[model samples]
Target: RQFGAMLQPGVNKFSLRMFGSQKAVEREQERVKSAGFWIIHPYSDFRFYWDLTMLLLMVGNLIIIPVGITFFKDENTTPWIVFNVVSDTFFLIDLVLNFRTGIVVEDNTDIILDPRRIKMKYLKSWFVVDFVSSIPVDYIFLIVETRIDSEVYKTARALRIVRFTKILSLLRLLRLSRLIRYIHQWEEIFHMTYDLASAVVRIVNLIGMMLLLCHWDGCLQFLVPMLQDFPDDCWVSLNNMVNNSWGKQYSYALFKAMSHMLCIGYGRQAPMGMSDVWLTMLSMIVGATCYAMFIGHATALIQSLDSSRRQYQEKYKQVEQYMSFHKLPPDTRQRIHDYYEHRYQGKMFDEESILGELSEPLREEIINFNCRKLVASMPLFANADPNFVTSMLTKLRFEVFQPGDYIIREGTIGKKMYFIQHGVVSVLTKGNKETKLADGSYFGEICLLTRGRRTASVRADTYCRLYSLSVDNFNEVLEEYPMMRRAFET
Candidate 1:
């Protein structure tokens, strides 16, 4: 947060000045935050966010590239060419960004901004993998095709002059080696956000991963076996695809790979040649490896996803001990658990204290927002002055009552008024007569207003959520603002 000094690596705090090695380290980290055009800090927020952006692109390209090369890559010409080259630009730019981005040296906090040092680490950590992988082979081939302007598609058997470019097509798969880093990023992405949402990007990310695998498997299903003169033993060269258009061939190949991916290739592609046989073995192993890892993680995810349930169960365990300690009967335990179901719904938090920590305005805004439903249902607060409403809201306290619980007994001088948040209540007076009021209804206010007292007892029909205001706070506010008292009377 300030560039190493206002901003973020998130939640890092400011501190008092230091003078020893700590001071030097602080000064050095401050320099790392300073924006320099020649070489930049590797650990800066800008770099972190930029990395996230690139991975996001990887998330996008993961699907398209495997498909772009496999499905749309018959003879591999035209718009697909445009996309590969354009997509290649980022990898190339990242190559440059890496060279420009310096590292946190020694302690992982100190940085080197010297241009030579940045390049030194890049070459040593070494840019070869990315550079070699980012090598735009097809781009050069694009130049070759357009400039030479030769009719390679039509010339000779399988169009040797242009079809030979499949050799370049062959080289493109080497680019997929970057897939390793993408996987690493996937792991990092989850750990960063996993403490949060259950319905997160991982599901989509996971689907993208499995699909990318199948697509790659499918492409090579056709690419490798047929690249060698389209041999008769190969599916691409065989009778079924003999005069078939490139699209049909792609479908056949994809079908081969997919069937192999799930339950092994029982289809027509039963490893017709030795090479095909070897490739089939490869696909099977990869599929086995991928499914073991992916599905196993998926199983783990489903289990881990029930973390909320686990917490609820934790509460239930404590509840069991609590009731057991109290020597409550079986029925009481059952009803207590039922009451928790309505209120917590398997989710619980200290919401009041969390709100308590915020600034006055922010807390007020949030409390008011939450209180909207409660206030909207009660006619007394309607069109009320903001200060009066604010005073009223602050005075309230929430309490829960369960079935058959007597909220107020007949002839009792009630000192609190209850505002129903949820569930129904029964009012019982003499002669066994009963009346009911459900959510948004209030009781005991009549007793609080005067010595009329609770002439009728109120009983919960279902577990109820209610807010209460003590007679003291009610009378104090009403005394200052008698119109509110008139509101209850009218």
Candidate 2:
């Protein structure tokens, strides 16, 4: 909740401009203000709306194409010609509006007023396509009247396939399809992939060049019979011949070591005597045992994506439905996204720090990585409390539960209590029992200290990693330091 407060919901700038005066725009902005985080801003919204419209348009055009090919094949009817003229006229009008609005301008400068300037820009692909789409419908009657050749008519009609661009635009309306939005999130990944690709290409070229320098004609004696006497062409495939076998082996070995070091030894083999087959089987077993883990992770990712899409759609739709909810213009969503992109990129904020977001295992790894000093620096743990800390640490057992798994059941006497390591658990107490604990920082201490039946059932809301402590462990701790029991349990 603290993190959500800082981020704004997505806004669409183009919609703001097109419908800024409308109350719908204001209401959309209000919804965005309420959510706090905005990932899809104006560019995204414009793309979604525009693409959706385009997709619908393309579908319509495609439907018309099939009809034109079949039902309107002869094309001599007066009503059919009239219908084509009306549709083409509408398209030309739409094209004019889009051109005037600068819909095709990638930079979105909104500079389409001057006729001469518009004319110059119209020579671009966007204008050409719009013109192409319009002329076919407009000239359909003219072509039929002039009795154009079948070949020419067929060639012109084939251009209708391009109308499907509208459908492609509609598909772009999907949140997942928005490039402007995800660019920020995946910039690092893109750069890493690009660099890796570039490195591979450079390495290949370097190896090829090296092969060229080693043209010992004698080395190619066995293979050169097929080649026509040009030395360069003759030994082109023997690139590694120039390098000694031992040198090549040493270089390859060193390269392997360096590659493993860089990749953290991701796919390297273990020692020779170790059975890879056995290890693979063991890995498969472990992976199967933890198969729910993969499913849970995928489920969470899907939920997050779904939530984000729903958030954007609801924000826009609510504003359109109710004037009372209006605040900022519809375009504000887009502006906010653009603002955040510029403001947040290459910028660091303490608010974005990932310390609190770490999983329990990660936190433990961090703590243990620096554990030597942590224990040494603690004066309370030095001489006063060896048994107490040991007892607590020993009681800390890791557990993982699949979704819908019950960690603790209601009405049952719970002998053990748990600390959440990651994910969520819901506490359900029937009637007055305070049934469950969810988003709880701490709980279950009551069951550990007292003999009363569990007041609530705790079920995993999602797959969860937890730290559990049994009654036996609690009793051992109680025996070591009787005084500590009241402090932890009470």
Candidate 3:
């Protein structure tokens, strides 16, 4: 019933942008005038799956455009024709879908959901390319092709001959832009894949691209000679394989294409005509660039795979350089080295930036997850009083101490309570009283409880990891929840 109150179906031709009552979600519309719009999140279920579906169609066009224009001249229409038209139908749907889909703000993590903003973004970006290319040029071709199926020769050759002279094939080939579009989609789709997984995906993607190029060249192998006035002048006729099986013809063409694509020349039969010669030269040039790009991409992927070591080394190098330049003392250098070894653990990452990007509650929860064990295990943090834990958690600052570091000095002011996350420490008092403690132990509370100065000294027995809570934080939190004072009293 509350969902009914929130939904506010509120539909109109001009109001809702032609799609009625589908993805309308209400967040701020109840009070704000600029709310209650039906917007599709860029990564939501519908948009993600739709993008996936389009990727499949992009591959469809990958084969369809070259092969369809090459293989099926004019004899009769096949299911490829239907598939082509259907695929266009889907593109047209996405053409409209994009207008309603929210866009990610420029470098800011939030998605811009306002329909006007979405319309402008799509219109400014991929709108024209998608609009022009999804026009179903083949639908008209299909109609004409279906009409000519009866006679199939006289009318067909004329259309193919003349139509290709100006070449709407060039216009339809713009569908391949989606393939380029798909390349970027691969990044978002595999955005945070494991390093090995990223490498694997890249490897497969590069290999597929090479194969797809060869396939296109192979298809063009048929179309080129077919476009000529004299079929006998082409490679197919020179080899006397015009009447061969489609498999036999295509495989040979693919082989020739592969050689040309590798910047290698003809295997057995070279082109006789100027047109074929020009194509071969052009393909060889294209082949060289693609080959370089493929190699470079593979190298970049390999470089990133071991980027764990590279980035860590990069960080350590800067520190070492800085330390060496300053001519730091050996004891300080060793302490810094030990501290970094424990803190970094052989990896470098901007943990603050990553955490900072998270939503407020999630960031709060993440910090709680990290500090909760120390906060919870301490008897002073009562029950699961979320506010009390949160108050303490935010104030706790992480630190590391090398062996012999004095955490607290005898008879000195006590301004902090320390929680030992790891390592060992020794507490020394009068009468030669020395006590040892390790991970899970805490200290400095004796002075904190009394509001007096430290009665003893504590030194790091080993490299220690700790979080220190200031006296101000303890008193501030304790004053509101006085029961916490009793928990510490015992």
Candidate 4:
């Protein structure tokens, strides 16, 4: 494909089909390499790995916050310098990668893979920022300080404040673009382990909140002290009285920030100026808003869980009462309970009722949302016209059956065909031999197409959830898309 390469069956491996023969693909690969474009396009599996690598590096930059707080305070030099050097080295590589990476064409989905166009787009976009961030400003300052005469260096070295421009690299925070786009890949993981995934999401949210709070606190601590004259009893004054250590002042600042943000009264110190008072007012509003937001979210989650539990309990009580009134056997009652438990656990709800309450467009969207996977899972539906599948899914009726229930009897005329959502069913033919169909499997489709009696008897081997489409709905779609009917025959 010219638009994007198809990923091969391994991590970070991809192949371009070109015009589709082995020789053609090889020729395309050679042409790509000679043009310095191989693996440099930004919309392929190759670029995905590069973006992931850059994402981890951006996360590494977060370490700068803690290192900034501690390293400057402790007069630690070696490790800080080493860390910046390593980080800047990777940033330099990223700068080179940016220059080479192809970008999307303006107003179109196609990538501009031409090397000259790629470089031009990048230069117009992120090149200046990347260039500034990749420079070893700190190292250059240190080299000038060590090698140059004190008087000459002092006169010239004020220019070293240019090193602070490195902070602008924080713009790399926008590196979130790729991560946000790829985040949906985790949806499959979330479905597989919903509880675990949910817990991880909550943890990430908490971590982000704490990090934001700490960053604001750290910055305000330094700025507030510089902006005011403090009483001897104030937090900053007390820090100076002890050792005048910036670290101690910062610790007090962090405590002050947290106390204000939590609406906890300051213990011994008071605001020193109108600026401090305004800061306090802002903190109050932020604290109240954040606290209320978290509390509301927590309450909603609890209410949702409590409501589900109460509904299930009420349902169970009703079932037990009816069974007792009828003097039902314990064995029959157990089966009923099992079926109820399965349905409740699945959180099965009335889709038709929900859709009926919605507008036509919205109803179509809801049906499409639920049946997309079901359509993709069936071979007949998967290979048929998309509109035909959409029409069929809109008419699908959900049904559930218990063990030993006959879904379709051999020699009975079929009115509908079933697509299993889950659980097992056995197809019994004239002989004793049987075949089992499980989730994603469809049966009785032959009868639906031929307008004949069922070729086999199908009995539920366990609690089964299925979607079925009536023969009339089937024929209605086939009439509009006759090629689909032919596809089915093939």
Candidate 5:
């Protein structure tokens, strides 16, 4: 469906002028082919496939970060080296694809399909970053070091410290660039999850907490080992002294970091030096900020919800007090309160007054979209031109009636017409005449068309929901669309 929308006639067309020349036409066709006229554009399904694949691969690269940072001391091991090679290969492929993809026009739906333009646009943007991050600098260094070892060089053993070059894979953390690109391009997918997921702010908080935890683990992973001796009481030191593996030692380090950061200090251990003290203070500052933000956001969310519902609760209280003073029947009071709650949800603000604050065009656009179905239910409206229907829709006033409410009295003047969107209404008249109008029905038009008193009465049968058009607007619109008035009369 999205591809079809992109390929819509005007959307896909070239603005080239042939000037009555066959050669010009041929030249345009050739340029189109070279520019990949039929190729999938960025954000298209075909490109989304590439984006999603690269996004997942980039995430995998990020996930392996801890292992690369803290584990696998041997760089020459087959499995470890092979893993690095394959991950870098995907990054290289992504870099190539980035240069090939088309660029989207800034303000319009069209894509720039010119090959030179596509290349220049990307080259000026993320090209250098992608190229730098794509290269396997660590793997190349390993290759050079292995060659030195094979040649029986004295520096070969010295080259063992070159294993620290594996830290260059940390540069691939720049793979975060690709992750951000996919997120910005597919924000709609994230929005679709809004109903089921936490807000983006809270998600960011969680991500921030995890990043801080990991950084602490990475620092302590090295710091504990460099210390002269274990503290015997400190969990951070004891873990390094006993549990040498990455998983266990990192877990204990994280536990200590979190305890100190949160000001909990449950492990009851002090920093061994100025360096440890600075790290502890940094974690405490970050923890304090995170805690403050969490409390602030939670309070704001609660206040926002209360604000929306508070008006209704206050109104209900006022009504209860007034009814007690009047000595109204219990059943009558309950019915009135229930009707108020069911209809307004505690908000007393008029929708029109709120909408009136908007510009005329914006106000009209909102009303037309919201009342489209209600307007379409009237035969006179549904058959009218779109502009006529839109005018009528914009003038509509929404109303709700309780089951026993009298909407129109027989032989009384009819000042408005109504279109039923839900529930039922009974029309009653002289000689015991009666008819029930259900959803998608309209009434009170007969009197308006004739400019006379209503011949029948209309009463709500089951809490009818409706839109009304006043007599003045009715006549004004009919004056412009005389044929519409004829339809209403018929």
Candidate 6:
């Protein structure tokens, strides 16, 4: 695309026009000769690919992580070395390129840098995976020094397997699909994740209480100098710890104690008494359990957030449908309905997955109840034969539209007839008086009966609920049930 910028010749066509117009035209022809190069270059215009490609890479890496461990324990080290070197090389190169691109702190566009913005505008996961996979491979040096001939080389090689997580980054791009226009769907998730992160941070602070209790036990560096006059074994006031604003406040008391027992004595810490080793061990176990509680809390929060998002999405659709049905084009309205249907199915369990769990008749009853009231209002369906009406209801697709939407355009071939079950629509005729189709009114039957083009542009003038019937299916049903065709024609 950069090279082809010559064809258009403005700011956009700069590269393409680099050689002057005559040479540029000839350059295009010359580039067309190599099929393989052209195939790879097809992505020059692929605005949609980068995100999904990364998501896939992350997912692939995750799948391999567990499997890679299995391969490491086996006797083979050759494949392990090859894989590790390749993965480490790729990660290093990716990190340098991404950093040079300034994609780590800044998103793809400068607009994302603002803290006020909610969306993750940059390629974030790749940056994370790149850094993680590039953890120094100095273990290779250690192997050379010890000279133990074992599959430890393969195990070390498996370290690069972490880079595979980059594949899942593709899911980020899937959000760019035109159908995913509403930010509400994804925004809720972002908010929930943000809150969970905050909650975890808050809980980390809460652990200060646990630390203060341990510090009171003299598990920390020094005993209070004045308190030596009192019994050292006795309880100390929690107030003293909270009030102390001086050097060595107790926030890191637990971490300090844990590190002491780990024999990582390099940190500035009070000496541990032999008798308190078991006590310190007990304190360590309690601190670890406290940390696990935060994980549990996060999991519960996630469940609640998922439920709330789905509920809000459905309600948003309902309210928008109620407010804007009267003024949209038919195709535009249909697109909206398709969007909702996809969202509903995607966020909930699939019907097929739940089918055996619910009896067939009961499932149909639920569907019928949800659609029945709106379906009954259309005279087009009511006057038709019961069997045909029932069948149409089964095949019937529902839609909601905002006002000023185009219902049907004049001169366009249409294969569906629409019934306004609720709200109102206006028919802008090519000739004669303007017509209004309110709730219970029907249009597009002429096209259904005669297979002719629409004679006028019909649109919603108010929020509307529409039920449509496909013309192609209507013809097939007509062959076996010829009696039903009369109602539509009439």
> For residue 348, what is the lDDT in candidate 5?
70
Clashing pairs in 1: 1-7, 2-5, 2-6, 2-7
User: Candidate 5 versus the native: TM-score?
Assistant: 0.63
Candidate order by lDDT, decreasing, is 3, 1, 5, 4, 6, 2
lDDT-better candidate, 1 vs 4:
1
lDDT of 6 by residue, 228-306 (tens): 3223331222224333432334334434555543345423433244323444555456655754565576577556657
lDDT per residue as tens, model 5, 1-490:
4454332112221222212355644443343345434544454445666677777787777766655554545435757567767877878877886766645444233445666777798889888888878887666766677676665345645444353464555576776777777665554333443343445544574565456455545445445443323454344564443547766665566676567555687344676655566666776777657666666766676566566578778878898899999999988998888688778866777786789799988888788777887778766568779978886676788888888878987787888888787899999887876789888777787756567878788788897888887879877877888767766756
Give per-model TM-scores.
Answer: 0.54, 0.25, 0.64, 0.47, 0.63, 0.36
Give per-residue CA lDDT, model 3, range 345-386, as digits (tens). 898777678788999889898888878777777665647477
lDDT-superior candidate, 1 or 5: 1
Per-residue alpha-carbon lDDT of candidate 1 for residues 370-434, written as tens digits (9 for 90 to 100):
56677656556667888788877777877888888898877887888787878899889887777
lDDT of 2 at 57: 52
Report the alpha-carbon TM-score of model 2 versus the true structure.
0.25
- Output the worst ten-in-a-row residue range by lDDT, candidate 3: 24-33
- Please write out the lDDT profile of model 4 over residues 127-151, one tens digit for every residue: 7756765676545655565676456
lDDT of each: 0.67, 0.45, 0.71, 0.62, 0.65, 0.48
Off by over 4 Å in 2: 1-57, 70-73, 102-123, 137-490
User: Which 10 successive residues of model 5 have the least lDDT summed?
Assistant: 9-18
Say which prediction, candidate 2 or candidate 3, comes out ahead on lDDT: 3
Which residue segments of model 5 deviate by more than 4 Å?
Answer: 1-40, 44-46, 105-125, 139-169, 188-243, 260-263, 266-268, 287-339, 345-397, 403-406, 409-412, 417-446, 449-462, 466-469, 481-490
Model 1, position 181: C-alpha lDDT score: 57
Judge candidate 6 at residue 210 and give its lDDT.
42
Q: Kindly report which residue stretches of model 6 are placed more than 4 angstroms away from their true locations once superposed.
A: 1-273, 294-300, 307-359, 370-385, 480-490
2 or 3, greater by TM-score? 3
Judging by TM-score against the true structure, name the best candidate.
3
Each candidate's number of clashing pairs is 4, 35, 0, 0, 1, 46
List candidate 4 segments past 4 Å from native.
1-35, 38-57, 65-79, 102-111, 115-199, 202-206, 226-234, 239-251, 266-268, 278-346, 349-490
- Backbone clashes in model 4, listed as residue pairs: none
* Every model: Cα RMSD to truth: 11.1, 27.7, 7.7, 11.5, 8.4, 21.8
Cα error of candidate 4 at position 28, Å: 12
